[PDB]
Design a protein around this ligand. Sequence first.
Ligand code: S6P
Ligand code: S6P
Ligand code: ZN
Ligand code: ZN
Ligand code: ZN
Lengths: 188, 188
Amino acid sequence: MMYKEPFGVKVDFETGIIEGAKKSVRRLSDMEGYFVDERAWKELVEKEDPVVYEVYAVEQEEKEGDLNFATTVLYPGKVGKEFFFTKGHFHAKLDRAEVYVALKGKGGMLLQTPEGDAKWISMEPGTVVYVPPYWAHRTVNIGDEPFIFLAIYPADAGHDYGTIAEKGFSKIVIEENGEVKVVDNPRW
Amino acid sequence: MMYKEPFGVKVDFETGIIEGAKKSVRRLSDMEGYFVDERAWKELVEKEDPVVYEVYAVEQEEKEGDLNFATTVLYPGKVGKEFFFTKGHFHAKLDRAEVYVALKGKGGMLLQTPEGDAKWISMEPGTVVYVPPYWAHRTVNIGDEPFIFLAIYPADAGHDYGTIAEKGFSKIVIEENGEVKVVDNPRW
Ligand SMILES: O=P(O)(O)OC[C@@H](O)[C@@H](O)[C@H](O)[C@@H](O)CO
Ligand SMILES: O=P(O)(O)OC[C@@H](O)[C@@H](O)[C@H](O)[C@@H](O)CO
Ligand SMILES: [Zn+2]
Ligand SMILES: [Zn+2]
Ligand SMILES: [Zn+2]
């Protein structure tokens, strides 16, 4: 039998960078129809088009039982009152769970079942989050610096962004009067 | 249908402690027939029987697609010339991979195929080790302080200790003349 090579790689807990990883970049312009305030989205995209997040992914072939891992650097920012977040997805194989290891910054995760019932888990350095089977998941940076975490996921989990792209989450995370609020999404 | 509850838990990267996790403890007496120097083992068990390592495990039902995670605190020490290590295991479902995230200390992982061919990976804080399908794996603390890491594995991976308990690994990690050597196992 042919065996894959074991390997070690350095992850910098300060920057989220993994040498030799597939680097992915999500600009604000790539997230049309994601934020509640459309005119604020339009305004910030034309003024700056900030990078919302970067992903450093170490991925195997899509084989059951095997594991991928990836860091996300989610940048600090707001669209209107709404904090920067990742697009959010269900796994293509829905029952595939996931483990997040928060490394730096302050954020949290919004999770949601196919039926639209949502949950908010705060994340700070050292917070390990268990994303159970079937839960869509989006990370949010509620802070002033990059929110950096490591995600470990089944290599055959895949990524389904379609349903979230159109409907979003049932809850949104906003700053009102200087305070972080998880409130119902008006657009849901 | 019923959905499992998402949750976050604090992991102290300094201590390896996971609040509310299942705690397992391995002392030297729990490791009979593991170390090369049979008489050194006996002496230490009778005098002290020190804790070799501790595991904090957050586990789900044994279900495909799900994930478990566990920290290990591998204490520093030697049996004869041979560094403290974990028992080592194959996964019961052999094709199940694993990811380790080194958190504190200095150490490494010994891996071995069903054939007996070996690989050594050095681990220091920040090192992420990819443990491929079919590789047995054992961690070793080659330093003076606790070696702490987080492991993330398929919830249906299982733990096969049998083969390793009787024959060990093909290589041993030892200190000869103040230097750390990965040499052939004579009792193999
Ligand atoms: O894939 P996104 O929603 O744009 O959030 C982006 C990434 O953090 C995300 O891929 C993360 O690595 C895992 O959840 C993958 O299963
Ligand atoms: O299972 P052990 O050899 O007694 O070393 C003990 C632990 O480090 C070990 O359970 C680790 O969590 C993972 O490899 C489990 O798949
Ligand atoms: Zn995911
Ligand atoms: Zn800050
Ligand atoms: Zn294992």
